[PDB]
Design a binder for this molecule. Structure first.
Ligand SMILES: *C(=O)c1c(COP(=O)(O)O)cnc(C)c1O
Ligand SMILES: Cc1ncc(COP(=O)(O)O)c(C=O)c1O
Ligand SMILES: Cc1ncc(COP(=O)(O)O)c(C=O)c1O
Ligand SMILES: Cc1ncc(COP(=O)(O)O)c(C=O)c1O
Lengths: 319, 322, 324, 322
């Protein structure tokens, strides 16, 4: 089922530096039950209901060129989903941001993926009081790619999965970022069996939702369409839609049919682990012209250039 | 959200009378983690195991009662088959798994225990990676004191339930309940709804409106000489399997097949079945009594025979060598 | 017994009043007139072949446009939705948009009815038409104009109705038979009506597979919360009464959102109302035995209802007087 | 263009095989010869049978029905059909305006007056169009020449099918396929999909991904000596019922229960079952051969036995008095 090669001349470029590895936390740092530890050594109690019940939600913020991107938006969504899942939060928004910034700073990574999750926990904590049994776990590790940097430029192929559907809103809601990947994993297997890189899942009514780790967007005659129901409201998606509106395009978050996809001018995936990815073939047929689309490239370009432009959306890490 | 427990004096559920020597640190609860038997309270897994971040894991729970394993072989076979269906390579043989489970219980000293075994997709190549295609999957095992979904008292006196209206069971073509798994998002939602509606538990319906199971147990009903229980969108429970064997031995018909809410509302009796507690009468449903509103005759006979099977020599029990 | 639905009682002084006139019954078409297989016929004589696939397969779609005070309301909107659904259903249309509107105008005119419901439907047909060619379409267009129909009575339009969220039935999915196409497949909707009756309410709202609010039997469901009007996007007919209510709402300065509606949204709503050509705008004053907001017809609902009926007497691109 | 039935009096059949029409002459001086309906109290020529446009059976599809057939002048399972018909009308809550005996007499009369020795006989009941010219339900009956979903040649040579991916079968908790009904929106969509993909017909899945039925027929499969067919979200067909009786008489096991696409793709044989044509081999599915790719061995024996039952005196047949 640390730094990476990227396309010369294109918008995705790691930082040019070298990491001080005297620190055992350099390269990847987790925070577990009050301790900053080397990511490789980070372990959780097997009795955490985050494991045995998948009673856990999370988000992933990224750092690029030493800048957090939309860290505040991420933690607010993380917090809103934990409230929806009814998991009490054992730390404030400010505290969580500080723990994430601490994991990144300690790791020294300028290109990084920062996971924070909260679990229902494993019962009373070692040692207090009504005191919360929820557990926060954080880690900052090298930036993750669902699709490689080369494919961020050259594009991927996809299928509409036929053997599995996305988890319904009234079973376990994709709106809450969650670790229940049973359907997403099955869809990844199906993609492999059919010779594609990834799969889009349909919901029970047959509408297009998302894929294993990314939102799905399409462009058609000057409008960008993306699903409202049975998907995570991704923050890459939010950015792409803000970019598209700046470019004068219209945006619609609403029901997306497979016929809409098949007729689309352009399709692309969006996720914090990779950014904006052209999808150039669907179910064996070309998407539009079969090459990364015009709007796709100009949205992807703007996305990466934002990593370096001062704005309310970026926050430099203090290392 | 919701070593010895109080039991009802004189009824069929009684713990072993004994003293547990605590000289060994494994006594009271023992886990097997990455090649080592450790005390349960110290059992920890890598946060990077996909069994966590993707719930890429399946498991079973077999129990020990009066120092006897109950249907250990059936549990391991089912566990192995679900792992195959989930496409998780198994890093152990059936015989190996059974010996780790016996070892955890033996080292724990517990005569009444719950024994969990699960396999996850793993966290990448194991430490001491010695080749690329050595299996990355992880097997974790633990034996801890026997767990009760419903208390020993409720096993005798019964519980009340609701049919959930705010959540449905995971469909077979999303993540199949037939594979025992840790994706409890819907089961936890149903637990919250029960609490908000003032009932002990909830039964979930599937997308077509049929009765499936609840949070940690199968649902069975009795009507005019037949025991009915869902086929689709449920775990094929081994407590359910035993209850149906017992029913047929009592002369009743058994039907594994679609169960409707109207069937439940007309039932003579309803009961829950799970390894974590056995056979539990369900005496009220959506605030209305089930049958005569007390534990039914067949439920009580099945429950009694079930616990007696923990003592009676059979192919179903395997005594633990402490 | 099931209750889905020339002059009926209305509330005196309120915005709903029939025309005061005398219908002359000399022409046998007066009071109700259908067009069936090239012929205008009295409504009571209107019959179709039992072998029409619109019956045996429900291979049929339709719309109902209404006449009030002798004015057609949004006739062209209706025929445009009608045609678009028939194309979605792949039923070839045996007439042009213009021809359809003329037939509908014909039926109303010949009926004499100043308050009427005008149904046009197209079926896959019963095979080769009498008098034929494999060339010729087999689809059948049927039309009728009969006295105006009320899902909820004129008095309930003023005083309000009570509803339940159905728990024993769900709305047909988009990938089974799409509610977006107005259709005659009312299996789920009839089940929901019976459940309403069993639970002591006037009607029921159906949820879809994912547990979201859709529509009721013959009407759309709208709600008002803190200055915004909400109504479902998916698994509903895009009603033209709904379309009109939203237009009115935005001219009152309210926001509007067509999109997913949850049961919890409804349970917190300030107001709830139904919308349909067969009766207009209906207050929903109790849901699942609980009061909706204050439990009386709500402020905005009453303004929207009032304005809707006023629009029947206001020349505009939306109303076309009937030539009697 | 929609093709639901391939073969709308006598049709061409495979010489020497089990399906053969009667050789007789129709007395056509009667207006009813060749097709006779009963509508609102009168027998009328089928081609002039018309119903009120205001019948809720049209405007709401508030209607259920069955079709029993006559072969070689014998009604086949007439009583079973009327009993299924009546039970579905009760489930749909449509009052029945005639007795079981009165229905069977009207069906027999329509056949007798038609003179058809091979006939399809439809009986339906609708909610009606209001107070009649008390109870408003309407019964309509017609006997017309026997109808073929698949032609007599393909009853022998077999057909090809696809599993529909563009549409799903109506759920039990929307409009239950268990009640035979005229709501074919989904079945028509599946028929168009079959046509687009170059196959003669399609099988529909339900919400959970299980195999249900097709447009006008049940789906059965054979694997290693057992016949499987869906339980949920299908009509409990009487051809299906007959085929499973024959299978059991032949010594095969029969299982009415959940059928997966994987099971179909693995089957030894697949066949369709319906009153409009009988038992049809399905020799290709999604462009792959079913089993060996020829009409299967058990399919052929069941089909042969089915047609021989049209002539063998038994509780299954009753001769029609013309
Ligand atoms: C029509 O009766 C109908 C509506 C309302 O749509 P209009 O406002 O009349 O266009 C809504 N939902 C259903 C199922 C209907 O049949
Ligand atoms: C299921 C799913 N959809 C979409 C996303 C991406 O959303 P975001 O842009 O906030 O990372 C994720 C992240 O991996 C995801 O898990
Ligand atoms: C969802 C679910 N259903 C049913 C069961 C009961 O199965 P068994 O009797 O094999 O323990 C379990 C727990 O044991 C379960 O988690
Ligand atoms: C949907 C459906 N399934 C199955 C069947 C077959 O049922 P029977 O064998 O009783 O005719 C029919 C008959 O046309 C049908 O309409």
């Amino acid at each position: 089922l640390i730094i990476c090669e990227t396309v010369p001349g294109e918008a995705i470029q790691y930082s040019r530096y070298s990491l001080d590895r005297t620190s055992p936390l350099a390269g990847g740092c987790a925070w577990i039950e009050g301790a900053f530890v080397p990511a490789a050594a980070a372990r959780i109690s097997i009795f955490d209901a985050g494991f045995g019940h998948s009673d856990v939600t999370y988000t992933v913020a990224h750092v690029w060129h030493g800048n957090f991107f939309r860290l505040e938006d991420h933690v607010e969504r993380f917090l809103a989903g934990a409230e929806k899942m009814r998991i009490p939060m054992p730390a404030t928004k400010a505290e969580i941001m500080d723990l994430m910034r601490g994991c990144v700073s300690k790791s020294g990574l300028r290109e990084a993926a920062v996971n924070v999750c909260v679990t229902r926990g494993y019962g009373r904590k070692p040692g207090k009081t009504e005191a919360l049994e929820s557990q926060l776990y954080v880690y900052a590790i090298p930036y993750l790619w669902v699709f490689s940097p080369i494919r961020q430029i050259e594009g991927i192929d996809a299928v509409i999965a036929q053997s599995v559907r996305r988890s319904p809103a009234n079973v376990m809601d994709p709106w809450i970022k969650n670790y229940q990947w049973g359907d997403l994993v099955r869809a990844t297997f199906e993609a492999q069996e059919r010779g594609a890189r990834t799969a889009f899942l349909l919901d029970s009514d047959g509408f297009v939702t998302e894929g294993p780790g990314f939102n799905v967007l399409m462009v058609k005659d000057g409008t960008v369409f993306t699903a409202a129901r049975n998907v995570l409201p991704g923050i890459t998606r939010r950015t792409a839609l803000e970019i598209a509106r700046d470019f004068g395009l219209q945006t619609v978050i609403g029901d997306v049919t497979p016929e809409m996809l098949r007729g689309a001018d352009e399709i692309f995936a969006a996720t914090t682990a990779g950014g904006v990815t052209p999808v150039v073939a669907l179910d064996g047929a070309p998407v539009g012209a079969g090459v990364p689309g015009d709007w796709t490239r100009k949205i992807r370009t703007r996305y990466w250039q934002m990593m370096d432009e001062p704005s309310d959306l970026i926050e430099p890490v203090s290392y």
